Amino acid sequence: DPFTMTPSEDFVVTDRGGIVENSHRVHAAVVDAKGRLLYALGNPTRMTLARSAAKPAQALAILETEGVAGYGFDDADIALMCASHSSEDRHIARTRAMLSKIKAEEADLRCGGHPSLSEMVNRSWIKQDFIPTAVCSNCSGAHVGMLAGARAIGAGTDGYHLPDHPMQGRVKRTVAELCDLDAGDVEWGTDGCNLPTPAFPLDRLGRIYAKLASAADGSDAGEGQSTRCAALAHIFRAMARHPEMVAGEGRYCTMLMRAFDGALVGKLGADASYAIGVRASDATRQLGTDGALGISVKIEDGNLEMLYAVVTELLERLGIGSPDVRSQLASFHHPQRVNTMGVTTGGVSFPFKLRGSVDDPRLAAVAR
Amino acid sequence: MTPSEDFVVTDRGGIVENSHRVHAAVVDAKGRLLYALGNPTRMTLARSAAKPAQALAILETEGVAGYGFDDADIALMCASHSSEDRHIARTRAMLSKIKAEEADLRCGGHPSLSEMVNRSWIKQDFIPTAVCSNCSGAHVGMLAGARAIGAGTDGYHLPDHPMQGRVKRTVAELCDLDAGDVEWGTDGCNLPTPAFPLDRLGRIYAKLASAADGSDAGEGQSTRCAALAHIFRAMARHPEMVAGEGRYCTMLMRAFDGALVGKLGADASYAIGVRASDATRQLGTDGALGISVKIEDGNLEMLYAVVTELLERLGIGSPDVRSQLASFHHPQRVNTMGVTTGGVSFPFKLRGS
Ligand SMILES: NC(=O)C[C@H](N)C(=O)O
Numbered sequence: 248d249p250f251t252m253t254p255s256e257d258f259v260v261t262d263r264g265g266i267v268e269n270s271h272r273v274h275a276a277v278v279d280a281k282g283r284l285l286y287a288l289g290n291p292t293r294m295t296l297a298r299s300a301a302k303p304a305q306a307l308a309i310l311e312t313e314g315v316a317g318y319g320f321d322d323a324d325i326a327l328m329c330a331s332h333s334s335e336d337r338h339i340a341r342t343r344a345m346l347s348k349i350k351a352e353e354a355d356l357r358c359g360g361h362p363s364l365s366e367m368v369n370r371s372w373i374k375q376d377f378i379p380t381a382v383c384s385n386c387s388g389a390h391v392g393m394l395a396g397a398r399a400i401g402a403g404t405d406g407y408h409l410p411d412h413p414m415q416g417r418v419k420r421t422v423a424e425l426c427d428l429d430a431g432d433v434e435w436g437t438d439g440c441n442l443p444t445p446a447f448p449l450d451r452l453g454r455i456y457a458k459l460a461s462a463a464d465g466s467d468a469g470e471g472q473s474t475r476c477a478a479l480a481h482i483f484r485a486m487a488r489h490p491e492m493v494a495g496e497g498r499y500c501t502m503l504m505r506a507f508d509g510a511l512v513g514k515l516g517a518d519a520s521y522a523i524g525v526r527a528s529d530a531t532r533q534l535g536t537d538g539a540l541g542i543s544v545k546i547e548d549g550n551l552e553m554l555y556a557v558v559t560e561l562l563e564r565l566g567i568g569s570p571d572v573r574s575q576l577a578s579f580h581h582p583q584r585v586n587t588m589g590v591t592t593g594g595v596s597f598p599f600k601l602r603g604s605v606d607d608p609r610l611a612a613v614a615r
Numbered sequence: 616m617t618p619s620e621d622f623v624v625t626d627r628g629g630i631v632e633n634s635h636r637v638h639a640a641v642v643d644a645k646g647r648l649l650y651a652l653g654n655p656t657r658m659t660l661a662r663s664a665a666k667p668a669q670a671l672a673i674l675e676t677e678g679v680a681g682y683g684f685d686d687a688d689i690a691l692m693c694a695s696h697s698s699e700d701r702h703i704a705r706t707r708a709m710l711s712k713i714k715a716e717e718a719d720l721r722c723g724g725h726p727s728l729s730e731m732v733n734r735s736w737i738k739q740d741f742i743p744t745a746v747c748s749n750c751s752g753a754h755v756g757m758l759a760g761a762r763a764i765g766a767g768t769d770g771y772h773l774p775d776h777p778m779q780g781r782v783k784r785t786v787a788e789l790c791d792l793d794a795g796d797v798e799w800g801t802d803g804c805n806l807p808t809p810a811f812p813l814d815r816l817g818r819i820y821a822k823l824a825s826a827a828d829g830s831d832a833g834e835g836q837s838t839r840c841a842a843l844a845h846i847f848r849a850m851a852r853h854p855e856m857v858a859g860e861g862r863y864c865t866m867l868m869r870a871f872d873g874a875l876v877g878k879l880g881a882d883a884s885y886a887i888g889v890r891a892s893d894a895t896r897q898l899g900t901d902g903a904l905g906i907s908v909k910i911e912d913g914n915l916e917m918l919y920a921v922v923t924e925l926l927e928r929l930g931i932g933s934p935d936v937r938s939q940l941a942s943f944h945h946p947q948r949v950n951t952m953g954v955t956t957g958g959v960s961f962p963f964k965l966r967g968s
């Protein structure tokens with residue numbers, strides 16, 4: 248019944264010859280530069296671990312640490328602070344160059360190695376029986392930035408990653424401030440790279456990224472800016488200018504940001520969250536806001552292949568980009584379902600319904 | 616009768632990370648529903664959890680007995696194996712028994728179901744071929760069937776071939792369904808693959824274990840019940856052929872040492888046939904039973920956790936026997952620095968009849 252559809256029915260589904268294989272619940276928020284909710288799927292306020300989708304907030308805390316500017320991190324270094332990189336040789340090399348800029352060593356890192364986020368890099372490592380180490384961590388840039396901050400303020404470096412350290416006090420405050428939340432409304436766990444990692448309502452992830460894009464707009468327009476807004480504009484510009492530092496070759500975030508050529512930034516969170524900050528455009532105005540826009544998505548069960556398909560579908564439905572811009576992402580939008588003998592056996596479909604405009608006022612939209 | 620909201624939930628520091636909807640059916644030897652999670656009649660692609668039904672169609676084909684397939688061979692017919700060297704070797708030995716060659720196979724190679732095997736392949740620049748297919752044993756069996764009735768081999772995998780007619784008929788008969796109540800797609804190994812209500816998958820495996828109980832007891836058995844008993848015995852005796860080293864199905868079957876068989880379906884279905892036992896009697900049935908599970912979003916890690924939790928709640932096996940599956944039951948959640956970051960919980964409740 249098309250007239251009784253509900254947020255609990257917002258799914259992405261794979262089929263085999265039209266027979267349902269898997270289904271995945273979708274949550275999404277689309278917000279303006281103040282965080283006002285414009286459009287949604289599922290539960291737009293779902294309490295959600297942002298994971299590395301919070302890295303730009305961490306980068307901001309680093310860049311606002313007094314004395315960090317003296318180290319001379321450049322835009323590519325800052326993009327690496329914002330990264331979940333593929334551990335390509337260029338990422339490892341930039342991590343080492345950033346350590347050198349602060350006169351630290353790999354032994355000062357408190358993150359550990361892991362298999363690469365890139366299948367092609369992992370393949371090279373397997374052939375050499377290479378064991379990744381701290382300097383290969385997908386989060387190495389943020390860890391180097393945290394060490395830089397710890398050094399700059401005269402804190403110890405030994406536990407820069409622990410919650411009682413002033414660098415982590417700074418991160419925690421910065422995250423809550425960007426979300427416009429009280430500290431008690433942000434919860435904290437520990438991430439795979441051994442840093443505190445925040446959870447907050449999903450819409451507030453979109454709010455962070457709307458603020459990034461909004462700051463980019465104000466900077467480009469030559470408006471006088473607070474030190475925080477200037478830093479948020481710098482982070483936006485760094486990510487958009489060096490999107491390969493943020494992820495790597497063949498990675499969704501890199502292909503997405505290259506396709507849009509400065510119009511937006513986007514960032515993956517592990518276990519299938521995604522955040523996009525969209526600069527003001529004809530598209531955002533058609534969506535009904537006079538400023539920048541933020542988008543946040545979570546696939547409830549954590550499937551990344553479905554995440555990229557859903558994010559690309561949502562961009563198409565919001566009219567963000569051109570068919571030509573978004574077709575650089577076609578392999579993520581409609582994932583290949585081809586068996587071992589070259590036969591297409593099924594596909595992906597998007598039975599979810601954006602809400603925010605039409606329905607009978609007696610239709611309840613219960614966030615679920 | 617509305618399906619419960621049954622989930623397995625992962626957390627990070629007590630904060631919800633992912634959740635996964637669980638469907639499960641526990642059925643007696645006639646397929647009567649005894650316990651359930653979620654929607655026990657969910658229309659579900661059985662994928663390779665249907666392999667024992669396909670092995671039954673092979674074994675019932677006229678003349679297949681003359682090739683001399685043994686119990687390990689039949690286990691391979693029932694398998695989604697890890698493409699270990701010993702699985703490839705047995706595939707080749709089975710092809711030799713029917714005087715066929717790898718070129719006759721109509722399945723294709725793929726990355727191994729074992730990450731460890733696949734890393735060894737990557738290290739050696741190895742490109743998997745037809746003989747490496749996790750379904751190679753079933754394909755050799757279907758080739759053997761085609762040859763045995765003189766059907767000719769080029770399209771043994773196609774729906775219009777009498778071998779697939781036999782498979783299609785056998786699946787519906789084991790489910791006790793009309794042909795129209797089974798739907799058909801195409802699998803990764805390029806065979807027809809069935810979808811039917813999830814409880815009927817449990818019914819297949821209850822019939823497998825019931826047949827083993829009746830064979831053991833010396834009962835008069837149909838040729839079909841005799842063959843189902845043989846399939847059960849083949850899987851339990853050669854569980855390494857069904858999957859491989861470190862695989863859940865192999866470790867599950869070794870742990871239970873003949874009390875049950877279990878089989879994975881791709882995209883996170885699972886089926887178990889349990890021979891009659893003190894545990895099954897405690898659950899309120901006088902015969903064998905079947906268990907079928909589907910994780911709605913297709914997550915395999917969560918599948919194995921849920922299946923092992925279900926076995927604990929059902930009392931199937933001793934605590935000592937189930938502890939061999941501890942690493943599947945509560946998957947590790949330890950970060951790159953050795954710190955435990957989270958866990959898995961099972962807020963579902965089995966509902967009974
Ligand atoms: N990259 C992410 O989203 C978080 C991951 N667990 C990490 O810290 O490496």
Ligand SMILES: NC(=O)C[C@H](N)C(=O)O
Pocket residue numbers: 661662663664695749750802803804805879880881882
């Ligand atoms: N192994 C399974 O469950 C089916 C798999 N896609 C295959 O045909 O190889």
